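User: I'm putting together a small comparison set for a docking exercise, and I want a reference complex before I start. The sequence is below, and the ligand is magnesium ion. Could you produce the 3D structure with the ligand included, as structure tokens?
Assistant: Of course. I'll restate your input first, then give the structure tokens for the complex.
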Amino acid sequence: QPLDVVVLLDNSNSMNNERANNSQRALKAGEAVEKLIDKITSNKDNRVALVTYASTIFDGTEATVSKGVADQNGKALNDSVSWDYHKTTFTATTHNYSYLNLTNDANEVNILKSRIPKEAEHINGDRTLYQFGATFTQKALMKANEILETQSSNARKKLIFHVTDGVPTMSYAINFNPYISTSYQNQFNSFLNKIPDRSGILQEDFIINGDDYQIVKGDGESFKLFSDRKVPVTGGTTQAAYRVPQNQLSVMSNEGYAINSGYIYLYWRDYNWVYPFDPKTKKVSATKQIKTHGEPTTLYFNGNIRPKGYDIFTVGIGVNGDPGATPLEAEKFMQSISSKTENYTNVDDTNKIYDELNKYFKTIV
Ligand SMILES: [Mg+2]
């Protein structure tokens, strides 16, 4: 049986070659993927596809991300020193680092290989694209799944190789209904009940039908969703605040900001809150609560990908759960998105990445 292989490649900001003590994660990950691609395609029967991801799919199309904090009414502002306060979404053309069609055409394969990234965005480089450097694992897995489901067949052996250095910091929302009396726990159980083994949630019960920036949970801040909606002062315990300069007071007042004696007190934007919550009164669920991006990603995986029988291998790079997951949560998570528990390996050395990919390829061929 010929092989149809999707490589999923993390190009998050944390992969930038200067990070983790100059260990060159993007370079080494990129070359490992390149070598894997050559090894797979030396059999003419085998096809390959490439999905590079961070906050979105890097496929050369335009994407939008939401950022910033908010006042007590959820009115968004960017408190960064590098951006005007109105700059609460970014819209940019992504790098073309993906090849979304399974191919065994030699010319096409070389095009795929030429799109493999060897670097990630730098905080002092392209600061707009840097906004797109978070970790939206579910979207990437959805894309790899979409390629195989639409382009492969029941007659072909299907593999995913996933190279990542971080737990998800964004997720698609589970579609809880706030306007019925059924508890959020009962609604969640009804979602599970649609899968034979009760272990996951079908794509149809996620909010998918709209632009990511409007509908996704998380903005790269954390693996966790926050129960305390107040932004703390870094190095205090008290709630952070944005001090309105004198010449911006009337404008910010007219814009509608909640200004209290010259200060706007700072809250996480509501895509970063524990959910579900009542959309009008803001009251959080008193039963089922989603508190991490790992949970919905794993529920998505079990409901929609895991039944399909693929071999899915995951190579982590210095994975420790940052930001917001414990090392144990991160490990279980990465295994939960691999087709077997032993199909996840976490390296502490970027020079071992290819060898772990090869090891996994060797169990197949
Ligand atoms: Mg990362």
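Residues 10, 12, 14-15, 135, 165-166 surround magnesium ion (CB under 6 Å). The longest helix spans residues 25-41.
User: Thanks, that's exactly what I needed.
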